């Protein structure tokens, strides 16, 4: 109910080794494109983990 809103953005979301690791779940996302996350920067994305 009190999910976080930390603005984890304007950074580098590299996923090379992330995709290599088989234990990982899902980062090939459907928002804009699965791979548009390595050098892409985020405007005001807030983590709600």
């Amino acid at each position: 109910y009190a999910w976080n809103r930390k603005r984890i953005s304007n950074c580098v979301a590299d996923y090379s080794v992330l995709y290599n690791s088989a234990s990982f779940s899902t980062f090939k996302c459907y928002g804009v494109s699965p791979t548009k996350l390595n050098d892409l920067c985020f405007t005001n994305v807030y983590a709600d983990s």
Partner: protein, 49 residues
Amino acid sequence: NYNYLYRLFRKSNLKPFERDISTEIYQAGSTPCNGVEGFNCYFPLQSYG
């Protein structure tokens, strides 16, 4: 009437006046596709309820 089908997604873009009957899915997210095709390969075609 699930006899009417539609494709989930196509690797290549659209193209005027052509038909594609591809029965294989791309290397999608988790469980992208076993080998080339087979199990754990989301059917690139979906029906209509």
